[model samples]
Target: EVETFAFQAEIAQLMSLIINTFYSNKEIFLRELISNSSDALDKIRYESLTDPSKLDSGKELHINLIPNKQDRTLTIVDTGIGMTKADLINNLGTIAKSGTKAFMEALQAGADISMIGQFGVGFYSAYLVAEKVTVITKHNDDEQYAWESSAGGSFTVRTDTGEPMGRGTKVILHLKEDQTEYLEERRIKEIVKKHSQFIGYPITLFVE
Candidate 1:
């Protein structure tokens, strides 16, 4: 197996700036994350329609929102194409934003998707509410993996020992004391509908 490179110092500084300075509004964080997930679902749906073999049969495309008030947790789960450990490292750890690197290179070199996705650094928004974030993902063609980070200098990625959900990803956020508003189901549904209702997929709130 290939060894992953540790995050560079510049990237850590970049992460701090992006996480703290760029996003002033907390609610937009939920919007950005859900919109990204919707984009992923849209991609899979498009692929499955054009190439049926790309997806599993009888798979229902959906998103799930679950909030735990007692634990101060908010979970965002999705059934879509997922990522592997390498993907987690490359996508999350590195500074792949084209605008910050080379605008012309991103525009003229067919790097639009990467540029657009990297533009909004909403992934780190979980840290606004939670001290730690856990991402459990299962890819269509690879083994499941879990990636955990506390927005510290380091993160751990390992093969997930839990039962695979067959496909998709789940993000669990353990909210801090001041950010308990994220634990409200109504607020979650409102945010999802507002930012991602037009996302071309069904989004559900997993309520008990």
Candidate 2:
């Protein structure tokens, strides 16, 4: 059975604030996502130092971008520490409920908490452009799963039937009508070049 869950706190208001505030710089959605992927990569890399098996993705950690014009979607894939089913339910399900309490406080006062990406709340920025966001992930310790959300109130998590991911996550964004501009490679390249040049991992875009 596909289990759906309610968000832990006031996610509707949080999402509304995030969506409305980032109006002009909608491109930061990509920046925020890339940074989240980078954080996962960093975590797995550091953990592998203690438990070598953590390099299940074969230490080929990096990020990939796939833009599909016909589908009107852009997918960001990362070979990093994937989330277990509980992680999906806990991490993807809740936002700013705990430390995020401090997180939201900072956002409210216009403080830029550089640590937000680590918390992965930056994932919500996808709503600034996507009507739906699909996350397909595989963790070494758990079976693969898919999590989806439109914005706030609720989200669903279920077993993923897509191609099996050895280890990592894929964030597929279903672009809003006017936000399809982000599906353009030229535009994405321009944005990544400026914001994520030094993220310390290969970020490749698939080509036809």
Candidate 3:
């Protein structure tokens, strides 16, 4: 079951700032998403040894890039523990955990601190390039669900109509017209290598 929640006013504002402020080099969004995928794969790989079944259920913890130039969309797929509805609300909506509030407060208090990649905030970096983002995920323990947002004040969550991604995640970026750099294989590969080649999982750029 997918649960829906409103973004805390502060979180929504922060998202807007992140989307509108960070206009320099839209390619960083790709790096941020890939880094998040690496983290997910790492989590699954570490837990696999203890359960063994986790790996069996969906062991292929790798990153995939699917680009449809025709639609100006770039989809990033991963095999990891997918988020449940509550997980989606907590993960996608509010910064209820992870000291995000204090971190922001500190930053505003004239503390020269950088919180860009802190916790899971990195995932929001996708808003830099995509006007519309759809995260479709399926956990081994629950029904598949999706979270859709446009970096606006609100977001919606619902049960996924598409088949589960075999206990992992896929982030589909409906890229803005000006964000065409992300649609090319060479550019995607270069960004991955520059930012995430050293990541443990294999990152594949799917282009034809």
Where's the lowest-lDDT run of ten residues in candidate 2?
111-120
Clashes of each: 0, 0, 0
lDDT of each prediction vs. the true structure? 0.66, 0.81, 0.75
- Residue lDDT tens for model 1, 53-159: 76773278888888887777788888877776677776453244543445334546674322333554447556655777888888776788888766656667788
Off by more than 4 A, model 1: 1-5, 18-24, 93-120
Residue 195, model 3, lDDT:
71
Clashing pairs in 1: none
The lDDT, on a scale of 0 to 1, for candidate 1 is 0.66
- Itemize residue pairs with steric clashes in candidate 2: none
Q: Which ten residues in a row have the lowest lDDT in candidate 3?
A: 111-120
Task: Give stretches of model 2 more than 4 Å off.
Answer: 20-22, 93-95, 111-120
Model 2 residue 171 CA deviation in Å: 0.6
User: After TM-score superposition, what is the CA distance of residue 62 in candidate 2 from its true location, in Å?
Assistant: 0.7
lDDT string, candidate 3, 115-162, tens digits:
456644767778778898899987777777889888667778988877
What's the lDDT of the predicted structure labeled candidate 3?
0.75
